[PDB]
Structure formats: C-alpha cells, structure tokens
Amino acid sequence: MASLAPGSSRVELFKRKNSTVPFEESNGTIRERVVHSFRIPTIVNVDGVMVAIADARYETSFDNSFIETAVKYSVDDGATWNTQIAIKNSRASSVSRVMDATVIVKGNKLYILVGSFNKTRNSWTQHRDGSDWEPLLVVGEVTKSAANGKTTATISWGKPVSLKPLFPAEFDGILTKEFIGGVGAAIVASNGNLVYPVQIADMGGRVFTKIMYSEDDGNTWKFAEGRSKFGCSEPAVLEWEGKLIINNRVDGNRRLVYESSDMGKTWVEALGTLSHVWTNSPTSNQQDCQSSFVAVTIEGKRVMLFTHPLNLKGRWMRDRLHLWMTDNQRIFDVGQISIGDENSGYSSVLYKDDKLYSLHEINTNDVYSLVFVRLIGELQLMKSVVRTWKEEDNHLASICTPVVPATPPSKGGCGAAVPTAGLVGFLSHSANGSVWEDVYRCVDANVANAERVPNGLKFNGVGGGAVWPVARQGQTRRYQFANYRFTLVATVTIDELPKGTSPLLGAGLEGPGDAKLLGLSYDKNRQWRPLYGAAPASPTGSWELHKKYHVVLTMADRQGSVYVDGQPLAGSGNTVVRGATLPDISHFYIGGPRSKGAPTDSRVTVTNVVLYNRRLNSSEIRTLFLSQDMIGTD
Numbered sequence: 001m002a003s004l005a006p007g008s009s010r011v012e013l014f015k016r017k018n019s020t021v022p023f024e025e026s027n028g029t030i031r032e033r034v035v036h037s038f039r040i041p042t043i044v045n046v047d048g049v050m051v052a053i054a055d056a057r058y059e060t061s062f063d064n065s066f067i068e069t070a071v072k073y074s075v076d077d078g079a080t081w082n083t084q085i086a087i088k089n090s091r092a093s094s095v096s097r098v099m100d101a102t103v104i105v106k107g108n109k110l111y112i113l114v115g116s117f118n119k120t121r122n123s124w125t126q127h128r129d130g131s132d133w134e135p136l137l138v139v140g141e142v143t144k145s146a147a148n149g150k151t152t153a154t155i156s157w158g159k160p161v162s163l164k165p166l167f168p169a170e171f172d173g174i175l176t177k178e179f180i181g182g183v184g185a186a187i188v189a190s191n192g193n194l195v196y197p198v199q200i201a202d203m204g205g206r207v208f209t210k211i212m213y214s215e216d217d218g219n220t221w222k223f224a225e226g227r228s229k230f231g232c233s234e235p236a237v238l239e240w241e242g243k244l245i246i247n248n249r250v251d252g253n254r255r256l257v258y259e260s261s262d263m264g265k266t267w268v269e270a271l272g273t274l275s276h277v278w279t280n281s282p283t284s285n286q287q288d289c290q291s292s293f294v295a296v297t298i299e300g301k302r303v304m305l306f307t308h309p310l311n312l313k314g315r316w317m318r319d320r321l322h323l324w325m326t327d328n329q330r331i332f333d334v335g336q337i338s339i340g341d342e343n344s345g346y347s348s349v350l351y352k353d354d355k356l357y358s359l360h361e362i363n364t365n366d367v368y369s370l371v372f373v374r375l376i377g378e379l380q381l382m383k384s385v386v387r388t389w390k391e392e393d394n395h396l397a398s399i400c401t402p403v404v405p406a407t408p409p410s411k412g413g414c415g416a417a418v419p420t421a422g423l424v425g426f427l428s429h430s431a432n433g434s435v436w437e438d439v440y441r442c443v444d445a446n447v448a449n450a451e452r453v454p455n456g457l458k459f460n461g462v463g464g465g466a467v468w469p470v471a472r473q474g475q476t477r478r479y480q481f482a483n484y485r486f487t488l489v490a491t492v493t494i495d496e497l498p499k500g501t502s503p504l505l506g507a508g509l510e511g512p513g514d515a516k517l518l519g520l521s522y523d524k525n526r527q528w529r530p531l532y533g534a535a536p537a538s539p540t541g542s543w544e545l546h547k548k549y550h551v552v553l554t555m556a557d558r559q560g561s562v563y564v565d566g567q568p569l570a571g572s573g574n575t576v577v578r579g580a581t582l583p584d585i586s587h588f589y590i591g592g593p594r595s596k597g598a599p600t601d602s603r604v605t606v607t608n609v610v611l612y613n614r615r616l617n618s619s620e621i622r623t624l625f626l627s628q629d630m631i632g633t634d
C-alpha cells in the first residue's frame with residue numbers, strides 16, 4: 001500500500017529459475033541454460049530498441065558466483081524480446097564472473113563496462129590486490145531493419161577490452177586496487193563525452209567514486225581529478241544545467257550527491273539541493289542500494305528521476321521501491337512502484353517515446369527476478385505535477401510587480417519579477433483543518449487549531465500553527481537544503497496581544513530545549529523578538545495589532561537575517577550557527593505549533609508562506625514586499 005499505480009502493470013521479464021539464456025560452451029555450441037537469479041537491471045533505449053541488461057547469476061544469487069551479462073532487447077516496446085549473453089566471463093573457475101554492468105548509449109552503440117573476476121570468492125573491495133580483476137569495456141551495435149513492414153533488430157557485441165592498463169597506480173599518492181562502473185545507466189555529456197561514474201577501491205580497502213570519461217568514443221579514457229568522500233559507492237551520474245550530478249550509494253549513512261561543472265575535475269557537494277536527501281532506510285544505518293538517476297524531459301520540463309527502496313525491513317530486503325521526480329528545487333515522491341511489501345532491489349527507469357518503464361529486482365528467498373514495469377499511472381501523475389510546477393512558476397513570473405525608483409521603465413510598466421528560481425514550496429490558499437497544501441505538491445505543512453482565511457490560516461488555540469517538516473520529513477529529507485541555506489517568507493497579522501512573548505515564524509532545531517536556528521517572535525510590548533541562533537533574543541522595533549507585515553528570514557553562509565516590511569531587524573546579519581557541523585532543522589514553524597511543553601497559543605494569521613533554497617537578494621526581498629497582494633492562490 002502506496003504501490004504500483006492503477007493503470008500500471010508489469011511482467012516478470014527475466015524470470016528466476018525459468019528464463020533461459022544462450023549459454024555458449026567452450027566449443028562454441030549454444031545451450032539454453034536456466035538461470036538461478038537475474039540481478040543488476042538496466043534498461044535503455046538504443047535508437048528505438050529497448051535493451052535490458054542484467055547479471056545472469058546462473059547458479060546462485062551470491063555476488064561471487066558464476067555470472068555472465070545477459071541482454072534482452074525489444075523493437076516493439078516490450079511486446080516481444082530476443083535474449084543474448086552479451087558478455088561472457090573468463091571461464092577460469094566455477095566463480096568466474098562479469099558483473100555490475102554500467103551502460104552508455106551513444107547513437108546505435110552501447111558501451112558496457114563490467115568488472116571481470118576469475119576465481120575470488122570474496123568481494124572486490126576486500127581483495128588483497130587487483131590481480132583477479134579486469135575492468136572490461138564491451139561495445140554493442142544495434143542494427144534495425146524493416147522488411148515486409150516488420151521491424152527487427154540485431155545486436156552485435158564486440159570483443160571485450162580491458163581498461164586495466166589505463167588505471168592509475170595511485171590517486172593522491174595512495175595506491176589503487178580495482179575499479180568498476182557505478183552500475184546502471186550512465187551518459188553521454190552534451191559535449192559528446194562518454195561519462196562513466198566509477199567506484200574505486202584502494203589498497204587500504206576504502207572506496208570512493210570518480211568520473212572516468214572519454215572524448216573520442218571510448219578510444220581513450222581519462223580519470224577526472226575529483227572524487228567523493230570515502231564510503232561512497234555505486235555512483236549514478238546525469239548532466240543537469242551544465243554540471244554532472246553524481247548521486248552516490250552510501251552504506252550506513254545518508255546518500256551524498258556532488259556536482260561538477262568541469263567534467264569531474266572539481267566536485268562540490270550539493271548541500272543546497274540533493275545531498276543527504278535520500279538514504280538507505282528510515283534509521284540510515286543500513287546497507288544502501290543502487291539507484292537509477294536519469295534526466296528526462298516531461299511536459300516540456302527537464303527533470304531528474306531517482307529510484308530507491310525505502311528498505312523498511314532493512315538489510316538487503318529493499319522493500320518499497322519509490323520513484324522521485326525533481327527539478328533540482330522541488331522533490332516529488334511519485335510513489336511506490338513495487339507492489340505491496342515485496343522485496344525489490346536494484347532498479348532502472350526509462351522514458352521512451354512518451355512512455356515510462358522500470359526494470360527492477362524482486363527478491364523472494366534471495367532468488368531474484370527482474371520485472372518490466374509499465375509506469376502508466378505514475379507518468380500521469382508526473383505530468384500533472386510538472387504542469388502544476390510550470391503553471392505556478394509561470395503565473396508568479398508573470399505578475400506585474402510595482403515599479404521601483406530604479407526600474408528600467410520596462411514592459412508593462414512592471415518592477416522585477418516575483419522570484420521563482422529556487423522557489424521550493426509555497427503555502428497559500430488551499431488548506432484544511434489539518435493540512436496546508438504545498439502549492440508545488442511536494443511537502444505539505446501540518447496544521448492545528450486553525451481557521452482558513454484567504455491565502456492562509458488564522459491560529460487560535462493551544463498549538464495553533466503549522467509545522468513545515470524538515471528533518472521531521474523522516475527518511476527522505478527533501479528540505480535538507482535548509483541546513484545550508486534558505487529564505488522563508490510570509491505575510492502575517494498579529495490578531496491578539498501575547499501574554500509575554502509568542503512565536504511567529506522560524507526554523508526549529510532538532511534536540512532538547514527549544515532551540516531555534518532563526519526565527520521571529522513578538523511580545524506584549526508590541527515589539528519584535530528576532531531569534532538569531534542561540535543569541536539572547538532582544539526585543540526591537542514596533543508593530544500594531546491587526547496590521548499586515550511582511551516577514552523574510554534568510555540564512556546562508558551561517559548568517560541569519562530577519563526582515564519586517566523589507567527592512568532588517570536589529571541584530572540581523574550575524575552568525576547563527578557555530579561549528580562546521582551542519583544544523584539539523586527539525587521544521588519550519590508558522591505561528592506557535594507544539595505537541596508538548598508550554599501550551600503556546602499564538603494568535604496570528606499567516607498567509608503566503610514561501611520557501612526558497614537560497615538567500616534571496618535585496619531586489620528579490622523588495623519585490624516580494626511590494627507584491628504581497630499579488631502572489632496568493634486565492
């Protein structure tokens with residue numbers, strides 16, 4: 001429940017202990033051979049032909065067993081498939097194996113990078129040296145042919161080539177041991193380069209990721225200078241707005257995401273967007289899982305698709321495969337694409353000719369099949385959401401804001417546009433007694449003791465207010481960016497005087513006590529009480545009951561400011577977080593929500609709460625101050 005959507009369906013395409021593969025004997029005779037388990041799915045489109053790539057783990061599902069690379073391919077979008085063994089293992093031993101295919105499509109060619117092992121019984125990261133290993137590159141060519149109106153295809157697979165001679169003996173003076181591809185679909189960059197994210201094991205047994213790329217269609221390969229932190233594995237890469245985005249598996253902690261604007265030379269952790277959003281299980285202390293990570297264009301908008309199990313059962317069970325869609329600002333949970341509480345695993349997603357598919361593992365008793373899934377209901381919802389995103393951004397960007405003294409007398413006589421770049425969430429008119437709906441359909445705020453008003457809520461009662469969850473999102477922390485930077489905006493009225501001080505808007509911190517990163521309170525003397533981290537919150541300024549004010553909280557570079565009516569309150573611009581440890585914001589609070597502790601009852605009305613993943617600039621703050629009556633969804 002939350003599960004493969006109505007409209008969608010699947011088949012067991014690579015059927016454990018059932019589907020055969022054309023195993024080639026040493027003498028060249030072909031034998032249709034049953035396969036215990038099919039693992040490590042990738043599905044891609046090569047010039048109209050679906051190509052599904054998988055480990056055929058012939059005898060057992062163990063990693064260090066007899067494995068070859070299987071392919072199934074279809075010219076009729078999966079009505080029918082032909083089956084190959086694309087890549088043979090060395091046949092050196094009973095555990096000879098080509099493993100963990102990583103695939104790039106360029107034109108009618110598939111570039112497949114696999115690890116190849118002869119006799120080791122333990123895993124690649126654990127080997128004493130690289131002697132049992134070769135990284136093999138194989139090129140497949142897809143040829144389509146039509147005759148009597150019947151399209152068919154063949155795929156020819158080149159002889160494997162070892163890239164072992166190209167593997168540096170060290171990086172930063174520490175010796176390398178082995179590398180393999182990051183698993184799954186990799187890319188051709190807009191400059192034509194073949195870009196593989198790779199996993200490197202050093203002679204110390206540590207692992208990290210790097211980009212290995214080719215400028216000449218695989219004739220030569222270069223390892224770019226940058227790398228992940230140690231502990232990152234199975235990286236997936238896409239290209240977004242001129243950067244590589246490298247999304248890493250991280251066993252036992254949250255997933256690190258890096259960006260590189262220079263073909264891997266320099267990596268910067270994506271603290272302001274996607275890093276640490278996703279994780280391996282609710283508690284983050286479990287073995288992680290491979291994920292697909294693909295850029296697609298849906299309804300005219302470029303988005304990234306990401307698949308990962310929730311792994312509520314933990315370990316390698318990997319139940320509850322989800323698909324997320326993000327425009328690098330908003331992050332939408334498309335839903336669970338596996339069925340019920342079944343164990344899934346590694347996955348792949350493909351958008352081809354305006355249809356969405358997945359190829360993913362299902363696991364019963366550690367026997368694995370690959371299901372081929374028609375994500376029909378999922379695509380419908382995705383298109384709806386992208387339309388919402390487009391419609392709202394367009395709407396906001398089209399508002400004619402008031403001219404200001406240095407407006408360049410422009411078109412329509414408007415001031416600067418309402419900012420939409422980095423606009424992550426927006427709470428406005430749509431709400432009920434318990435939910436304040438994110439206009440962008442990703443993260444609702446939870447509400448208590450509220451009454452609806454145009455564009456927001458009026459709070460009256462114990463814990464009257466809204467909680468916009470940050471760390472409180474739980475496993476997938478879509479607002480993790482806020483720990484690095486944010487702007488939070490709202491229009492407010494104070495409806496009744498507080499007894500002493502009462503909360504209005506801010507960012508709470510995880511931990512005991514009642515700590516806030518940045519926020520605003522108000523008091524019985526009709527002063528504001530901005531809260532700048534742990535600093536004693538000194539009253540300042542003046543407000544009137546019933547009057548609408550504009551509130552902006554900005555935090556970036558560990559500095560916090562609080563603006564009322566487009567002007568900073570005393571005490572703004574200083575450091576609100578100390579250390580080089582990111583804050584852990586629990587939630588944004590709007591009004592005085594609480595479920596425990598003091599029975600706060602902030603009698604305020606808040607409308608049009610906007611959240612950005614960056615610090616708005618002075619022009620943008622002014623624009624919002626001047627356009628408060630223009631942005632609401634009522």
Ligand SMILES: *[C@]1(C(=O)O)O[C@@H]([C@H](O)[C@H](O)CO)[C@H](O)[C@@H](O)[C@H]1F
Pocket residue numbers: 040063099100123125233234288289316
């Ligand atoms: C995958 C898995 O099922 O967890 O794990 C990797 C590997 O064991 C981990 O990345 C730890 O190094 C295997 O290579 C992969 O085939 C698959 F089993």
